[PDB]
Amino acid sequence: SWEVGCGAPVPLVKCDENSPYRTITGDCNNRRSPALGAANRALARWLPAEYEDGLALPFGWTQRKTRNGFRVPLAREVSNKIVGYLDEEGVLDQNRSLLFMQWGQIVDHDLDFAPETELGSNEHSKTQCEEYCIQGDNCFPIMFPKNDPKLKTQGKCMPFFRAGFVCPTPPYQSLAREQINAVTSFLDASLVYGSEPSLASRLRNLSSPLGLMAVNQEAWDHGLAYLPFNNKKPSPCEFINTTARVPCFLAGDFRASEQILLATAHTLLLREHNRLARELKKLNPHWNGEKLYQEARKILGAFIQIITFRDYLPIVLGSEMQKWIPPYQGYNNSVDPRISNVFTFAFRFGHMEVPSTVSRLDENYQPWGPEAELPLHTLFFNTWRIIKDGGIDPLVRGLLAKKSKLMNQDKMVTSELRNKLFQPTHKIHGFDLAAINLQRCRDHGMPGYNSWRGFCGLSQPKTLKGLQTVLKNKILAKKLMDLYKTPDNIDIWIGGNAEPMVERGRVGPLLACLLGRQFQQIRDGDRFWWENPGVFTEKQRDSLQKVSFSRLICDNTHITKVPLHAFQANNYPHDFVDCSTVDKLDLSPWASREN
Ligand code: HEM
Ligand SMILES: *[C@@H]1O[C@H](CO)[C@@H](O[C@@H]2O[C@H](CO)[C@@H](O)[C@H](O)[C@H]2NC(C)=O)[C@H](O)[C@H]1NC(C)=O
Ligand SMILES: *[C@@H]1O[C@H](CO)[C@@H](O)[C@H](O)[C@H]1NC(C)=O
Ligand SMILES: *[C@@H]1O[C@H](CO)[C@@H](O)[C@H](O)[C@H]1NC(C)=O
Ligand SMILES: [Ca+2]
Ligand SMILES: [Zn+2]
CATH code, domain carrying 276: 1.10.640.10
Q: Which is catalytic among the residues 109, 266, 273, 377?
A: 109
Question: What 8-state DSSP symbol labels residue 307?
Answer: I
317 vs 269: CA distance, rounded Å: 25
What sign for the dihedral angle of Cα 504, 507, 508, 511?
negative
Coil, helix or strand for 124?
helix
**In residues, how long is the chain?**
595
Domains identified in the chain, total number: 1
Measure 239 CA to ligand 2 centroid, in angstroms: 15
Q: Quick one: which H or E segment has residue 126? A: helix 124-132
The dihedral built from the CA positions of residue 86, 90, 94 and 99, taken in this order, carries a sign that is positive
Phi/psi-derived region of residue 412, left when phi > 0, alpha when psi is between -120 and 50, beta in every other case:
alpha
Q: How far is the CA of 482 from the centre of ligand 2 (A)?
A: 47
State how far the Cα of 500 lies from the Cα of 517, in Å rounded to an integer.
19
Q: How far apart are CA 413 and CA 407, in angstroms?
A: 8
Give the closest residue to 187 by CA, choosing from 28, 346, 12, 339: 339
**What resolution in Å is listed for this PDB structure?**
1.7
Do 427 and 240 meet the contact criterion of CB atoms below 8 Å apart?
no
Instruction: Report CA-CA distances (Å) from 163 to 212, 256, 309.
Output: 34, 19, 29
Pocket-testing residue among 36, 332, 335, 522, ligand 4, by greatest number of atoms within 8 A of Cβ:
332
Q: What is the 3-class SS of 164-226, one letter each residue?
A: CECCCCCCCCCCCCCEEECCCCCCCCHHHHCCCHHHHHHCEECCCCCCEECCCCCCCECCECC
What residues does ligand 1 touch, defined as CB less than 6 Å away?
A: 101, 104-105, 108, 112-114, 258-259, 344, 347-348, 350-351, 353-354, 376, 433, 436, 440
Can you point out the beta strands (E) in 363-507? 373-375, 403-405, 421-422, 429-431
User: CB pairs under 8 A, 24+ apart, for 313-316?
Assistant: 313/519, 314/504, 315/96, 315/100, 315/504, 315/505, 315/506, 315/567, 316/104, 316/505, 316/506, 316/507, 316/512, 316/515
Q: Containing H/E element for 101?
A: helix 98-111
Residue numbers after which the chain breaks, C to N beyond 2.5 angstroms: none
Method: X-ray
- Whole-angstrom distance, CA of residue 484 vs CA of residue 463: 12
Among 460, 499, 509, residue whose Cα is nearest residue 352? 499
Q: What's phi and psi for 589, nearest 5 deg?
A: -60, -5
Dist CA 496 CA 512 (whole Å):
9
Domain membership of residue 316 as a residue range? 1-595
Q: Which of 397, 400, 389 is nearest to 221 (CA)?
A: 389
Which residues in 133-167 are b (16+ Cβ under 10 Å) and which e? beeeebbbbbbbbeebebeeeeeebbbbbbbbbbb
Q: Which amino acid would we find at residue 415?
A: S
Number of H helices, E strands in the chain: 23, 14
215 lines ligand 3 (CB under 6 A): yes
Measure the CA–CA gap between 49 and 444, rounded to whole angstroms.
8
Cα-to-chain-centroid distance, residue 432: 17
* Ligand 2 close to Cβ of residue 374 (< 6 A): no
- Give phi and psi for 393, each to the nearest 5: -60, -50
Which of 240, 241, 368, 386 to probe ligand 2 with, by most ligand atoms within 8 A of CB? 241
Query: Which residues are part of a known binding site for Ca(2+)?
Result: 110, 184, 186, 188, 190
| For the CA of 214, the nearest atom of ligand 3 | 14
DSSP 460: -
Question: Mutation test of ligand 3: which of 202, 206, 215 has the most ligand atoms closer than 8 Å to its C-beta?
Answer: 215
What is the distance in A from the centroid of ligand 4 to the CA of 182? 27
Number of C-beta neighbours around residue 493 at 10 A = 28
